[PDB]
């Protein structure tokens, strides 16, 4: 299981970025993606999560500005950001949520929920002046 | 990675012999609210294949 | 959102809890609180999941529990590599998931 990040920057405020997340070893479609920035020297504020098919749920910062998107062909993960503010300075990370059946305690079956977070991306840094 | 093979990982219910379907709408395992939208206890139809 | 303390500290061997207090729709209506380790410079890491389990490949000390709507990771017998922030991410109760504010723990 493999997330590697690229697009981030620099770039000034009320602009537009796209960002990319390739996931090789599984898929946009098979578990719940989802992005989680992390100020520099700050806590984790999750952005947003888009399920195996047919969500667009974000934060309340960041509604209306980010809209998270996949190509299933490409199999990457991506986020536009527009509109960006001077508080969206943070690195961004890719977050995949857990596989069904994770680590398949023999009691619970097939139950998609599992909702936690598996392995992460590398993040790119996003500094908006 | 070919991930272009889906399996109805978890279909509404059990499959008559010779029988096919290809809705996808959202099966729901806990309450019923979910009206074709993944919820909480509301997963998305098939899967994909690796 | 979830409440954590800005730090805590130990010394090695014995055990510390760490707390992180919210609301009764996320811990304590549901389930499905997790617990994370990140070192500077470093991505985190699943600590906790699901409550009472644990991650295979992980040191057995660590333990997690939720008494209502408070979580609680114990970690026990505290070496030097444990030094690092912990973040406690519950679940979301419909989909606005959060995260603590942090305990940077700091082994004596």
Same mark, same amino acid.
């Given at each position: 299981?493999?997330? +590697? ?22 898929? +946009? ?6 992005? *989680? ?18 969500? $667009? ?9 980010? $809209? ?22 943070? *690195? ?35 500094? *908006?002046? | ?50 | ?23 009764? @729709?996320? &811990?304590?209506?549901?389930?499905? &609180? ?28 660590? @333990? ?42 700091? &082994?004596?």
């Amino acid at each position: 299981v493999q997330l +590697v990040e690229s697009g981030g920057g620099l770039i000034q405020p009320g602009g537009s970025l796209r960002l990319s997340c390739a996931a090789s070893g599984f898929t +946009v479609s098979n578990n719940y993606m989802s992005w *989680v920035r992390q100020a520099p020297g700050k806590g984790l504020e999750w952005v947003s999560v888009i399920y195996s098919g047919g969500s $667009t749920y974000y934060a309340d910062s960041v509604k209306g500005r980010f $809209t998270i998107s996949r190509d299933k062909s490409k199999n990457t993960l991506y986020l536009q950001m527009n509109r960006l503010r001077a508080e969206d300075t943070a *690195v961004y990370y890719c977050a995949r949520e857990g596989e069904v059946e994770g680590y398949n305690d023999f009691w619970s079956g097939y139950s998609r929920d599992r909702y936690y977070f598996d392995y992460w991306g590398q993040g790119t840094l996003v500094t *908006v002046s | 990675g070919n991930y272009n093979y889906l399996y109805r990982l978890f279909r509404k219910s059990n499959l008559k012999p010779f029988e096919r379907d290809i809705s996808t709408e959202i099966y729901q395992a806990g309450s019923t609210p979910c009206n074709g939208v993944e919820g909480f206890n509301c997963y998305f139809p098939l899967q994909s294949y690796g | 959102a979830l409440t954590q303390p800005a730090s805590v500290s130990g010394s090695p061997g014995q055990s510390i809890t760490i707390s992180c207090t919210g609301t009764s @729709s996320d &811990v304590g209506g549901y389930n499905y &609180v997790s617990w994370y380790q990140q070192h500077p410079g470093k991505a985190p890491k699943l600590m906790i999941y699901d409550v009472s389990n644990r991650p295979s490949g992980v040191s057995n000390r660590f @333990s997690g529990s939720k008494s209502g709507n408070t979580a609680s990771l114990t970690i026990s017998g505290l070496q030097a590599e444990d030094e690092a922030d912990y973040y406690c991410s519950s679940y979301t109760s419909s989909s606005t998931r959060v995260f603590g504010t942090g305990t940077k723990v700091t &082994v004596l």
